[PDB]
Amino acid sequence: GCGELVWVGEPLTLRTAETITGKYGVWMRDPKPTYPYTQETTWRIDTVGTDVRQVFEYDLISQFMQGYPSKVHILPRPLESTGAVVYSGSLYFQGAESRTVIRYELNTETVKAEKEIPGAGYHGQFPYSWGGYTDIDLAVDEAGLWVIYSTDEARGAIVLSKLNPENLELEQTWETNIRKQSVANAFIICGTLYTVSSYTSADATVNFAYDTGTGISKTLTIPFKNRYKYSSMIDYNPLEKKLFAWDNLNMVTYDIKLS
Ligand SMILES: [Ca+2]
Ligand code: NA
Protein backbone atom coordinates (compact mmCIF):
# COMPACT_ATOMS: atom_id res chain seq x y z
CA GLY A 1 0.00 0.00 0.00
CA CYS A 2 2.41 2.65 -1.27
CA GLY A 3 2.07 6.25 -2.38
CA GLU A 4 3.45 9.75 -1.98
CA LEU A 5 3.61 11.27 1.49
CA VAL A 6 0.82 13.82 1.90
CA TRP A 7 0.40 14.29 5.65
CA VAL A 8 2.24 13.90 8.95
CA GLY A 9 0.38 13.72 12.24
CA GLU A 10 1.19 15.17 15.63
CA PRO A 11 4.13 13.66 17.52
CA LEU A 12 3.23 11.18 20.25
CA THR A 13 5.75 10.77 23.09
CA LEU A 14 6.31 7.11 23.99
CA ARG A 15 9.25 7.42 26.41
CA THR A 16 11.42 10.22 27.80
CA ALA A 17 15.07 9.79 28.65
CA GLU A 18 15.94 10.74 32.21
CA THR A 19 19.60 11.72 31.77
CA ILE A 20 21.72 13.88 29.47
CA THR A 21 23.05 10.71 27.82
CA GLY A 22 19.74 10.48 25.99
CA LYS A 23 19.46 14.07 24.78
CA TYR A 24 19.99 12.52 21.33
CA GLY A 25 19.56 8.91 20.33
CA VAL A 26 17.92 6.36 18.09
CA TRP A 27 15.08 3.98 18.84
CA MET A 28 13.62 1.49 16.43
CA ARG A 29 11.76 -1.69 15.66
CA ASP A 30 12.47 -4.33 13.02
CA PRO A 31 10.17 -4.14 9.99
CA LYS A 32 11.19 -7.74 9.14
CA PRO A 33 11.33 -9.37 12.59
CA THR A 34 13.14 -12.67 12.89
CA TYR A 35 13.29 -15.19 15.68
CA PRO A 36 13.41 -14.67 18.64
CA TYR A 37 12.17 -11.14 18.15
CA THR A 38 8.71 -9.93 17.17
CA GLN A 39 7.10 -6.77 15.84
CA GLU A 40 6.90 -5.52 19.46
CA THR A 41 10.67 -5.78 20.07
CA THR A 42 12.17 -2.33 20.47
CA TRP A 43 15.77 -1.17 20.62
CA ARG A 44 16.99 2.10 22.11
CA ILE A 45 20.43 3.70 21.98
CA ASP A 46 21.21 6.86 23.95
CA THR A 47 23.92 8.39 21.78
CA VAL A 48 25.50 11.34 23.64
CA GLY A 49 29.22 10.93 24.27
CA THR A 50 32.25 9.34 22.67
CA ASP A 51 32.09 5.68 23.69
CA VAL A 52 28.53 4.71 22.83
CA ARG A 53 28.18 0.93 23.03
CA GLN A 54 25.04 0.07 25.05
CA VAL A 55 21.98 -1.05 23.07
CA PHE A 56 18.85 -1.42 25.19
CA GLU A 57 16.48 -4.19 24.02
CA TYR A 58 12.86 -4.56 25.09
CA ASP A 59 10.78 -7.64 24.30
CA LEU A 60 7.47 -5.82 24.70
CA ILE A 61 6.21 -2.34 23.89
CA SER A 62 5.04 -2.05 27.51
CA GLN A 63 8.61 -2.58 28.70
CA PHE A 64 9.96 0.02 26.26
CA MET A 65 7.41 2.53 27.53
CA GLN A 66 7.53 1.90 31.28
CA GLY A 67 10.24 -0.52 32.30
CA TYR A 68 13.83 -1.56 32.26
CA PRO A 69 15.40 -3.29 29.28
CA SER A 70 14.99 -7.02 28.88
CA LYS A 71 18.60 -7.22 27.66
CA VAL A 72 21.51 -4.86 27.09
CA HIS A 73 23.94 -5.52 24.23
CA ILE A 74 27.46 -4.10 24.43
CA LEU A 75 28.65 -3.38 20.91
CA PRO A 76 32.21 -4.48 20.08
CA ARG A 77 33.07 -1.03 18.67
CA PRO A 78 31.63 2.39 19.55
CA LEU A 79 28.75 3.68 17.44
CA GLU A 80 28.55 7.05 15.69
CA SER A 81 25.54 9.36 15.84
CA THR A 82 21.84 8.58 15.39
CA GLY A 83 21.56 7.02 11.93
CA ALA A 84 21.39 3.31 12.80
CA VAL A 85 18.55 0.93 11.94
CA VAL A 86 17.49 -2.63 12.72
CA TYR A 87 16.58 -4.89 9.80
CA SER A 88 15.87 -8.62 9.59
CA GLY A 89 17.61 -9.43 12.87
CA SER A 90 20.65 -7.17 12.62
CA LEU A 91 21.59 -3.73 13.88
CA TYR A 92 23.24 -1.71 11.10
CA PHE A 93 25.36 1.07 12.57
CA GLN A 94 28.26 3.31 11.72
CA GLY A 95 31.56 2.83 13.50
CA ALA A 96 32.75 5.89 15.40
CA GLU A 97 35.24 8.08 13.52
CA SER A 98 34.75 6.03 10.37
CA ARG A 99 32.71 5.65 7.19
CA THR A 100 32.26 1.95 8.03
CA VAL A 101 28.79 0.43 8.34
CA ILE A 102 28.66 -2.67 10.54
CA ARG A 103 26.05 -5.44 10.48
CA TYR A 104 25.65 -6.78 14.04
CA GLU A 105 23.45 -9.85 14.37
CA LEU A 106 21.51 -9.26 17.56
CA ASN A 107 20.58 -12.81 18.58
CA THR A 108 24.19 -14.05 18.35
CA GLU A 109 25.92 -10.75 19.18
CA THR A 110 28.16 -11.30 16.14
CA VAL A 111 29.54 -8.92 13.52
CA LYS A 112 28.53 -10.49 10.20
CA ALA A 113 29.65 -7.83 7.71
CA GLU A 114 31.46 -4.50 7.52
CA LYS A 115 31.59 -2.08 4.60
CA GLU A 116 33.14 1.30 3.97
CA ILE A 117 30.57 3.44 2.16
CA PRO A 118 32.67 4.47 -0.88
CA GLY A 119 33.58 8.14 -0.82
CA ALA A 120 31.19 8.97 2.00
CA GLY A 121 32.00 11.94 4.16
CA TYR A 122 32.11 11.22 7.86
CA HIS A 123 32.65 12.82 11.25
CA GLY A 124 31.23 16.24 10.46
CA GLN A 125 31.82 16.62 6.73
CA PHE A 126 28.19 16.23 5.52
CA PRO A 127 26.05 16.12 8.66
CA TYR A 128 22.47 17.19 8.73
CA SER A 129 21.92 20.79 9.79
CA TRP A 130 22.09 20.18 13.55
CA GLY A 131 25.53 18.58 13.36
CA GLY A 132 25.96 15.57 15.60
CA TYR A 133 28.25 13.75 13.14
CA THR A 134 25.08 12.71 11.27
CA ASP A 135 26.96 12.22 7.96
CA ILE A 136 25.65 8.66 7.32
CA ASP A 137 21.96 7.80 7.87
CA LEU A 138 20.70 4.25 7.37
CA ALA A 139 17.11 3.69 6.28
CA VAL A 140 14.65 0.86 5.81
CA ASP A 141 11.65 1.13 3.50
CA GLU A 142 9.27 -1.24 1.73
CA ALA A 143 12.07 -2.47 -0.55
CA GLY A 144 14.73 -3.08 2.14
CA LEU A 145 17.90 -1.38 3.32
CA TRP A 146 19.37 1.94 2.18
CA VAL A 147 22.05 4.43 3.19
CA ILE A 148 21.88 8.23 2.93
CA TYR A 149 25.16 10.15 2.81
CA SER A 150 27.15 12.54 0.66
CA THR A 151 30.50 12.68 -1.12
CA ASP A 152 32.94 15.29 -2.40
CA GLU A 153 31.93 14.40 -5.96
CA ALA A 154 28.30 15.11 -5.06
CA ARG A 155 29.39 18.49 -3.61
CA GLY A 156 27.55 17.69 -0.39
CA ALA A 157 24.21 16.85 -2.04
CA ILE A 158 22.30 13.92 -0.60
CA VAL A 159 23.32 10.60 -2.15
CA LEU A 160 21.40 7.45 -1.43
CA SER A 161 22.33 3.86 -2.16
CA LYS A 162 20.41 0.61 -1.89
CA LEU A 163 22.32 -1.88 0.26
CA ASN A 164 22.57 -5.65 0.19
CA PRO A 165 21.59 -6.45 3.80
CA GLU A 166 23.67 -9.61 3.93
CA ASN A 167 27.10 -8.31 2.84
CA LEU A 168 26.55 -4.51 2.65
CA GLU A 169 27.39 -4.23 -1.05
CA LEU A 170 25.98 -1.17 -2.78
CA GLU A 171 23.45 -2.22 -5.39
CA GLN A 172 22.36 1.10 -6.92
CA THR A 173 23.12 4.77 -6.19
CA TRP A 174 21.21 7.99 -6.86
CA GLU A 175 22.37 11.60 -6.49
CA THR A 176 19.93 14.34 -5.47
CA ASN A 177 20.39 18.11 -5.64
CA ILE A 178 19.53 18.63 -1.95
CA ARG A 179 22.37 19.92 0.22
CA LYS A 180 22.52 17.43 3.09
CA GLN A 181 23.71 20.04 5.59
CA SER A 182 20.75 22.26 4.66
CA VAL A 183 18.09 19.83 5.99
CA ALA A 184 17.43 18.53 9.51
CA ASN A 185 17.07 14.83 8.62
CA ALA A 186 15.77 12.55 5.89
CA PHE A 187 13.96 9.24 5.43
CA ILE A 188 12.73 7.04 2.57
CA ILE A 189 9.14 5.96 1.95
CA CYS A 190 8.33 3.68 -1.00
CA GLY A 191 11.58 4.60 -2.74
CA THR A 192 11.19 8.36 -2.33
CA LEU A 193 13.61 10.34 -0.18
CA TYR A 194 11.98 13.03 1.97
CA THR A 195 13.74 15.74 3.97
CA VAL A 196 12.69 17.81 6.98
CA SER A 197 13.40 21.55 6.96
CA SER A 198 14.19 22.26 10.62
CA TYR A 199 14.99 20.37 13.81
CA THR A 200 13.82 23.19 16.15
CA SER A 201 10.58 24.63 14.77
CA ALA A 202 7.04 23.67 15.71
CA ASP A 203 6.22 24.77 12.13
CA ALA A 204 8.82 22.86 10.20
CA THR A 205 7.92 21.09 6.96
CA VAL A 206 8.70 18.01 4.97
CA ASN A 207 10.22 20.22 2.30
CA PHE A 208 11.80 18.11 -0.48
CA ALA A 209 11.18 14.76 -2.18
CA TYR A 210 13.38 12.81 -4.59
CA ASP A 211 11.74 9.78 -6.25
CA THR A 212 14.34 7.13 -7.10
CA GLY A 213 11.89 5.49 -9.51
CA THR A 214 11.40 8.53 -11.69
CA GLY A 215 14.41 10.76 -10.98
CA ILE A 216 12.07 13.66 -10.22
CA SER A 217 12.70 16.17 -7.42
CA LYS A 218 9.86 18.15 -5.85
CA THR A 219 9.29 20.75 -3.17
CA LEU A 220 6.70 20.09 -0.48
CA THR A 221 5.08 22.04 2.36
CA ILE A 222 3.79 19.27 4.62
CA PRO A 223 3.76 20.49 8.25
CA PHE A 224 6.13 18.72 10.64
CA LYS A 225 6.22 19.56 14.36
CA ASN A 226 9.37 19.34 16.52
CA ARG A 227 7.48 19.35 19.79
CA TYR A 228 10.58 19.57 21.98
CA LYS A 229 12.68 21.75 19.64
CA TYR A 230 15.63 19.45 18.98
CA SER A 231 15.09 16.50 16.69
CA SER A 232 18.24 14.44 16.25
CA MET A 233 16.78 11.39 14.47
CA ILE A 234 13.87 10.98 12.08
CA ASP A 235 13.36 7.61 10.38
CA TYR A 236 10.52 5.71 8.72
CA ASN A 237 9.30 2.22 9.69
CA PRO A 238 7.58 0.55 6.70
CA LEU A 239 5.86 -2.13 8.78
CA GLU A 240 4.13 0.31 11.12
CA LYS A 241 3.93 2.99 8.38
CA LYS A 242 5.01 5.60 10.92
CA LEU A 243 7.90 7.96 11.52
CA PHE A 244 10.10 7.22 14.55
CA ALA A 245 12.02 10.19 15.92
CA TRP A 246 14.15 11.40 18.82
CA ASP A 247 13.44 14.96 19.96
CA ASN A 248 15.29 16.47 22.92
CA LEU A 249 15.16 13.45 25.29
CA ASN A 250 11.83 12.20 23.89
CA MET A 251 11.20 9.08 21.81
CA VAL A 252 8.29 10.10 19.59
CA THR A 253 6.25 8.67 16.74
CA TYR A 254 4.24 10.31 13.97
CA ASP A 255 1.44 8.83 11.92
CA ILE A 256 1.52 9.52 8.18
CA LYS A 257 -0.81 9.28 5.17
CA LEU A 258 0.23 8.21 1.67
CA SER A 259 -1.64 9.00 -1.56
CA1 LIG B 1 16.81 9.50 9.04
NA1 NA C 1 18.53 6.13 10.08
Author numbering: 244 to 502
The authors write:
Inherited missense mutations in the myocilin (MYOC) gene, within its olfactomedin (OLF) domain, constitute the strongest genetic link to primary open-angle glaucoma via a toxic gain of function, and thus MYOC is an attractive precision-medicine target. Myocilin has no known function, and there is no glaucoma phenotype in Myoc knockout mice or in individuals with a homozygous N-terminal truncation mutation or hemizygous deletion of MYOC, but rare non-synonymous coding mutations lead to toxic intracellular sequestration of misfolded myocilin. However, not all mutations in MYOC cause glaucoma, and common variants are expected to be neutral polymorphisms. Among the common features associated with pathogenic myocilin misfolding, we demonstrate that a single metric, OLF thermal stability, can robustly segregate benign from early-onset disease variants.
At the outset of our study, five variants could be confidently predicted as benign polymorphisms: T293K, T353I, K398R, A445V and K500R. These mutations are all found on the protein surface and well documented in the literature. Three of these variants harbor conservative substitutions (Lys to Arg, Ala to Val). Modestly lower levels than WT were detected for T293K, E352K, K398R, N420Y and A427T. Structural integrity was further confirmed by high-resolution crystal structures, which were solved for 11 OLF variants. No gross changes from WT OLF were detected for the structures of T293K, R296H, L303I, V329M, S331L, E352K, T353I, K398R, A445V, V449I or K500R, indicating that these mutations are accommodated within the native five-bladed β-propeller fold and do not perturb the dinuclear calcium-containing site.
